[PDB]
Amino acid sequence: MVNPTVFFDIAVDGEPLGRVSFELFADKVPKTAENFRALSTGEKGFGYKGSCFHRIIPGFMCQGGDFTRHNGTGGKSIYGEKFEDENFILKHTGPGILSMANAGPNTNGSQFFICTAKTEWLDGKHVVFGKVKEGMNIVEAMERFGSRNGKTSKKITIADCGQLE
Ligand SMILES: CCCN(Cc1ccc(N)cc1)C(=O)NCC(=O)OCC
């Protein structure tokens, strides 16, 4: 019944910054929520722990989840390399929205982004599946290490991640 919660412990050039937690909307997008949850716990033997936010654009979003190529060209889901767009019920309404990155229709893997602005033009193209619950202040701190082209000025990593009770 209850939507699961996951956390990321963020580091900046290896130095701890803080925690971001997310509510995953399993009630509306169970398949997509389950992929992110499982990648966050690492229970399939692969996932987000140790990966980086490779693209951060202030006033837009923070993108991560590429644990196979580390640069925005890789990643894989718990269902295989790719899976379908589950639905587009939820919209990109503002800062804190958690949504899947993709390379065309039905190409979800492991890459995701956290919005730092309303990104309405992505509605119906990227599957929204969660939101920041606590630590939007930490997301805003991460965002300051981005740039217009997305290259980060320090290495922004998920030092630890998992599921909260
Ligand atoms: C041709 C670029 C596709 N990629 C990289 C990507 C590669 C594989 C997967 N599974 C997801 C994204 C993208 O990052 N596309 C843009 C995007 O998703 O932005 C969200 C705000």
From Swiss-Prot:
Family: Belongs to the cyclophilin-type PPIase family. PPIase A subfamily.
Positions of post-translational N-acetylmethionine modification: 1
Cellular compartment(s): Cytoplasm; Secreted; Nucleus
Organism of this sequence: Homo sapiens (Human)
Record-linked Pfam families: Pro_isomerase (PF00160)
Residue(s) carrying Phosphoserine: 77
N-acetylvaline modified-residue sites: 2
Chain positions of cross-link Glycyl lysine isopeptide (Lys-Gly) (interchain with G-Cter in SUMO2): 28, 82
Catalytic activity as recorded in UniProt: [protein]-peptidylproline (omega=180) = [protein]-peptidylproline (omega=0)
PROSITE patterns membership: CSA_PPIASE_1, CSA_PPIASE_2
Residue positions, PTM Phosphothreonine: 93
Residues annotated as glycosylated: 108
GO CC term (a single one): extracellular region
Post-translational modification, as annotated: Acetylation at Lys-125 markedly inhibits catalysis of cis to trans isomerization and stabilizes cis rather than trans forms of the HIV-1 capsid. PPIA acetylation also antagonizes the immunosuppressive effects of cyclosporine by inhibiting the sequential steps of cyclosporine binding and calcineurin inhibition. Acetylation at Lys-125 favors its interaction with TARDBP.
Protein name: Peptidyl-prolyl cis-trans isomerase A
Complexes and interactors: Interacts with protein phosphatase PPP3CA/calcineurin A. Interacts with PRPF19 isoform 2 (via N-terminus). Interacts with isoform 2 of BSG/CD147. Interacts with FOXO1; the interaction promotes FOXO1 dephosphorylation, nuclear accumulation and transcriptional activity. Interacts with integrin ITGA2B:ITGB3; the interaction is ROS and peptidyl-prolyl cis-trans isomerase (PPIase) activity-dependent and is increased in the presence of thrombin. Interacts with MAP3K5.
Outcome after substituting residue 121 to F: 75-fold decrease of sensitivity to CsA
